[PDB]
């Protein structure tokens, strides 16, 4: 180790599992409410009507998501299963 | 935190219906006081050697 | 206040350990450099001497180092101000979580002891309602979406209201536009739509 | 040792500021980061997203 010398080591405030008790809220807070709980208040909407929020906000009208809205839901699982095998091989 | 749950639903929204005008105080240094040191006056007293 | 206080503690406190090192002798047999003068020799007192300028020069060394991080703290906290300052009060900035938590509408900076305040004006809701939405209405096989309001339903009838406050309306053509047939989306249902051009051609 | 330390204890108290200061940054650099929210949500047991 490197504490014999009296180089001590100060243990973090935030122990890990906090840290991933707040990315957890985080995760729920942006995928049951979007942006209204970081600015007020949590308000309840579903998914596919926050994806066609997000849309709006890149010039796209919304009316594009409900029609392949299975096509982009697969496009993000093999997304998340691409980003989670790249992470895998530093 | 307060341990709460939303309640989530594939057909429930909430659109709220009242506001409140809040305001945030936010504390921001610019700027520090200007000091000048010179070391004839700080190392060196009242002798030339 | 915190912020204000520290940069001048720190810069007092710097001060204070700056003269506290004048009163050291850096293993010399004194401090002040007139009693070895007076007491011994300069040829004999050099070493003395020497080693004095040594652990001054040392002390302004760590001092201004200590003041030149400062000067970079306190320049990026400038930088972050200034910023804050062109985006908040010399306009609107849609920077959610920026200019303070809510949905931000102005600032009004106010001038401060070395540093500056923002009184920001937030828009944050107070009252929410549970309501009953869909993402397209089905007229006449033609899928209805809304154009800047959301679909939702009191549990009889349907209206059409903005995100960030409830104002219902009638489901009309003015705020919907229609897209494709109705067997698109997953979740739909029936309603009807008011046509303001119908009773006034009549 | 520690007889002659008594001429450089400022420097020591400089260096003990600086690490506690360094510190204290640190515990601080958590909070500004992951504690944006002050409630806890729970993820609902419903899973059709
Ligand atoms: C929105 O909230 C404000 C703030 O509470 C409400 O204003 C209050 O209304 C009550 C009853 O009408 C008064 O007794 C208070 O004096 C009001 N307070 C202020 C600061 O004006 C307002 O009524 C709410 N609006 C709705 C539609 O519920
Ligand atoms: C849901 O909204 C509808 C539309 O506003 C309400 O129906 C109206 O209610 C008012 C209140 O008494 C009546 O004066 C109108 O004649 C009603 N119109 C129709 C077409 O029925 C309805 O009451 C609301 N329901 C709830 C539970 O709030
Ligand atoms: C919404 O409206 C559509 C069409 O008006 C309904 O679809 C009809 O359903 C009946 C029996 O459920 C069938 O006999 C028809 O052939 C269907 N027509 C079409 C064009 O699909 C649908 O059932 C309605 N939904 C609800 C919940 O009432
Ligand atoms: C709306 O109703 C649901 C259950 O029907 C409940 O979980 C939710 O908290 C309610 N929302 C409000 C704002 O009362
Ligand atoms: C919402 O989800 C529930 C549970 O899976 C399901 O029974 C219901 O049909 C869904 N409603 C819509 C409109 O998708």
Redesign the interface.
């Known amino acids: 180790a490197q504490k014999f010398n009296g180089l001590t080591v ?1 243990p ?3 122990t890990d599992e906090m ?1 991933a ?9 942006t ?3 979007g942006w209204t ?2 600015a007020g208040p ?1 308000l309840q909407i579903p ?1 596919p009507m926050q994806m066609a929020y997000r849309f709006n906000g890149i010039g796209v009208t919304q009316n594009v998501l409900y029609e392949n809205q299975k096509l982009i839901a697969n496009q993000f699982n093999s997304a998340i299963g691409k980003i989670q095998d790249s992470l895998s091989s530093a | ?10 057909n429930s929204i909430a659109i709220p219906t009242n506001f409140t005008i809040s305001v945030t105080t936010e504390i921001l240094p610019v700027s520090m006081t200007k000091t000048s040191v010179d070391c004839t006056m700080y190392i060196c007293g009242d002798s030339t050697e | 206040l915190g912020k204000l206080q520290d940069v001048v503690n720190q810069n007092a406190q710097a001060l204070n ?1 700056l003269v ?2 004048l009163s ?4 010399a047999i004194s401090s002040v450099l007139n009693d070895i003068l007076s007491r011994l020799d300069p040829p004999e007192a050099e070493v003395q001497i020497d080693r004095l300028i040594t ?1 001054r020069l ?2 302004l060394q ?1 001092y201004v180092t ?1 003041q030149l991080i400062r000067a970079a703290e306190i320049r990026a906290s400038a930088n972050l101000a200034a910023t804050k300052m062109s985006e908040c009060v010399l306009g609107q900035s849609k920077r959610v ?1 920026f200019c303070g938590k809510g949905y931000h509408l102005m600032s009004f900076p106010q001038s401060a002891p070395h540093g500056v305040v923002f009184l920001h004006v937030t828009y944050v809701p107070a009252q929410e309602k549970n309501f009953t939405t869909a993402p397209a209405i089905c007229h006449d096989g033609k899928a209805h979406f809304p154009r800047e309001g959301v679909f939702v339903s009191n549990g009889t009838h349907w209206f059409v209201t903005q995100r960030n406050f409830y104002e219902p309306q009638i489901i009309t053509t003015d705020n919907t536009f229609v897209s494709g047939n109705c067997d698109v989306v997953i979740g739909i249902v029936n309603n009807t739509v008011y046509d303001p051009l119908q009773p006034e051609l009549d | 040792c520690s007889n ?1 330390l ?6 020591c ?2 260096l003990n500021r ?1 690490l506690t200061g360094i ?1 204290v940054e ?2 601080k650099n ?2 500004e980061v ?11 047991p ?1 899973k ?2």
């Open positions: 100060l973090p405030l935030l840290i008790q707040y990315t957890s809220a985080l995760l729920a807070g995928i049951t409410s709980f970081g949590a998914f | 935190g307060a341990e709460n749950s939303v309640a989530y639903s594939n | 350990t506290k090192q050291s002798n850096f293993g652990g040392q002390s760590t200590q979580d | 002659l008594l001429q450089y204890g400022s420097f108290t400089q600086a510190a640190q515990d958590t909070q992951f504690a944006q929210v002050k409630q806890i949500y729970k993820t609902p419903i059709d997203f």
